[PDB]
């Protein structure tokens with residue numbers, strides 16, 4: 317019964333798994349990109365403080 | 371021809387896009403998780419280094 321399906325399943329029905337897997341991967345890439353930028357910033361902050369501390 | 375294809379294309383030829391996209395997804399989840407955990411560890415390290423009492427010299 318379609319009433320029992322969640323949004324993810326409805327979307328896949330309408331757009332197909334190639335589309336939904338592609339969007340999932342794009343979003344994962346956006347998330348990982350953001351996380352690695354935060355990693356870069358944390359490392360920069362750490363280096364500045366090591367320098368401050370001598 | 372097959373001789374001109376790079377590795378990624380050979381794997382897709384043999385396994386198809388559902389398999390290769392699924393593998394990419396799984397690697398991306400793994401990478402995301404590792405990146406977020408690493409960030410947490412760096413934040414912990416900065417708290418520890420803020421206490422300069424244990425500072426090597």
Ligand code: NA
Nearest residue numbers: 418419421424
């Ligand atoms: Na310390």
